[PDB]
Amino acid sequence: MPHAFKPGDLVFAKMKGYPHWPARIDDIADGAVKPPPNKYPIFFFGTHETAFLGPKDLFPYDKSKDKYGKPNKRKGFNEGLWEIQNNPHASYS
């Protein structure tokens, strides 16, 4: 039975204007900017961008990969697919 989202969780994350995108829930570093309430820090594989999203835009990676885990013309996407499959917990700084 599912829990709330926690840092380390792998997802596809949905932003307007973009396809469902390989991502993870990030930690917040000591001293770093906190997200707004009820939002999560989302790290997008491939582009290495961070956005703040709520659960309605977060789809568990395992359940959704068959649908969303296919190659895409969009910049960074295919790099993103490799990262989430091959080293999803790596430092990408």
UniProtKB/Swiss-Prot annotation:
- Show which residues constitute the signal peptide: none
Its subcellular locations are: Nucleus; Cytoplasm
- Domain PWWP spans what residues? 7-64
Tissues showing expression: Widely expressed. High expression is found in heart, skeletal muscle, ovary and testis. Overexpression is frequently observed in hepatocellular carcinoma samples.
Q: Which domain of life is it from?
A: Eukaryota
The free-text function statement in the UniProt record for this protein reads: Acts as an epigenetic regulator of myogenesis in cooperation with DPF3a (isoform 2 of DPF3/BAF45C). Associates with the BAF complex via its interaction with DPF3a and HDGFL2-DPF3a activate myogenic genes by increasing chromatin accessibility through recruitment of SMARCA4/BRG1/BAF190A (ATPase subunit of the BAF complex) to myogenic gene promoters. Promotes the repair of DNA double-strand breaks (DSBs) through the homologous recombination pathway by facilitating the recruitment of the DNA endonuclease RBBP8 to the DSBs.
The family classification in the record reads: Belongs to the HDGF family.
Q: Assembly and interactions?
A: Interacts with HDGF. Interacts with trimethylated 'Lys-36' of histone H3 (H3K36me3). Interacts with trimethylated 'Lys-79' of histone H3 (H3K79me3), but has higher affinity for H3K36me3. Interacts with IWS1. Interacts with H2AX, POGZ, RBBP8 and CBX1. Interacts with histones H3K9me3, H3K27me3 and H3K36me2. Interacts with DPF3a (isoform 2 of DPF3/BAF45C). Interacts with SMARCA4/BRG1/BAF190A, SMARCC1/BAF155 and SMARCD1/BAF60A in a DPF3a-dependent manner.
Protein name from the UniProt record: Hepatoma-derived growth factor-related protein 2
Parent sequence residues shown: 1 to 93 of 671
